[PDB]
């Protein structure tokens, strides 16, 4: 295991392998010697910039709040030996064998698998939206998977509670988000679920833009260019409306012709997910009720969740921004509670 990876945690743990490395997080499997359990441990260095600490805090609070089969379970967070020596956060969780990006890229999935994977994703999304929480960073690599096909969502630091920063991967970003200054909505998460479903049918990203312009061009090339004022109602930013009117006038591409071998019911669900107007985009709940998922749909086993007030992320709303030290205390409270 990369000798450069160092975890300032109890010697009872024995790092096994590097599962993920990014500027925000580093994830490794590790063995808890005393019990023999193999766990996943996510290391974060939250205190060089408030932004990092806010994300850490939002991720930890969400993890601890949900107890749902499709939301990665958190076992515990390591307790530092002191406030002075508290420089990294180690979130200990249940170890999954891999993520959906790795799966879609290394495996031929049957229609059954696809149904089961998108079903579980929407099932986690439903309990989140029912709690007034939007993930905002839904993509294959943030969907953890096991051999038996169980799926769990992870990476909840960019979440927000309804009513300089880390940006979500443009390929999965809803068009109303790239255009207007759009207010966080449940629909943006569904749009990402649509790109994920499409990614499962195609085995590659459906909208891999180079940048902002290219992204919009790719999206409309498939869903059709919004043209009339009825279509443009959902867009506020006047600048944004003029940019849209400058695009080629694309009709909705005929998905079933382009991909004749995909279950027609699946294309139907996908099309309802990739709708321009966020108000006309299917909801997670309705998607679970779609015919394409009737094999796994169960109205009595689909947690709706319960409202979480905005004050849950109170720290995100200060006139005078919180200092690193303020957030360190807030994170500490979370760890020791």
């Amino acid at each position: 295991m990369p000798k450069r990876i160092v975890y300032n945690i109890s010697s009872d743990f024995q790092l096994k392998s590097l599962l993920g490395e990014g500027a925000y997080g580093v994830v490794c499997s590790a063995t808890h010697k005393p019990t023999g359990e193999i766990v996943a441990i996510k290391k974060i260095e939250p205190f060089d910039k408030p932004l990092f600490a806010l994300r850490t805090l939002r991720e930890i609070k969400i993890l601890k709040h949900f107890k749902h089969e499709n939301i990665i379970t958190i076992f515990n967070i390591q307790r530092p030996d002191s406030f002075e020596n508290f420089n990294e956060v180690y979130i200990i969780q249940e170890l999954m064998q891999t993520d959906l990006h790795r799966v879609i890229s290394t495996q031929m999935l049957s229609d059954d698998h696809i149904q089961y994977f998108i079903y579980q994703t929407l099932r986690a999304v439903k309990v989140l939206h029912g709690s007034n929480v939007i993930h905002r960073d839904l993509k294959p690599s943030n969907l953890l998977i096991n051999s038996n096909c169980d799926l769990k969502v992870c990476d909840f630091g960019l979440a927000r509670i309804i009513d300089v920063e880390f940006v979500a991967t443009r390929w999965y970003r809803a068009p109303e988000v790239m255009l207007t200054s759009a207010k966080y909505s449940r629909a943006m998460d569904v749009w990402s679920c649509g790109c994920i479903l499409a990614e499962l049918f195609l085995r590659r990203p459906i909208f891999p833009g180079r940048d902002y312009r290219h992204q919009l061009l790719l999206i409309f090339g498939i869903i059709g260019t919004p043209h009339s004022d009825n279509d443009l109602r959902c867009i506020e930013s006047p600048r944004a409306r003029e940019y849209i009117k400058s695009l080629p006038m694309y009709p909705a591409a005929p998905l079933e012709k382009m991909f004749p071998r995909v279950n027609p019911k699946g294309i139907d669900l996908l099309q309802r997910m990739l709708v321009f107007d966020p108000a006309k985009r299917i909801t997670a709940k309705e998607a679970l009720e779609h015919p394409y998922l009737q094999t796994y749909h169960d109205p009595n086993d689909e947690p709706e969740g319960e409202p979480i007030p905005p004050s849950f992320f109170e720290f995100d709303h200060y006139k005078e921004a919180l200092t690193t030290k303020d957030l360190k205390k807030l994170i500490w409270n979370e760890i020791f509670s």
């Binding site: 799966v103 698998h113 998977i145 051999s147 096909c149």
Partner: peptide, 11 residues
Amino acid sequence: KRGNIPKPLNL
């Protein structure tokens, strides 16, 4: 599990 669960993967 809860019914017609898909075939397991080789991961």
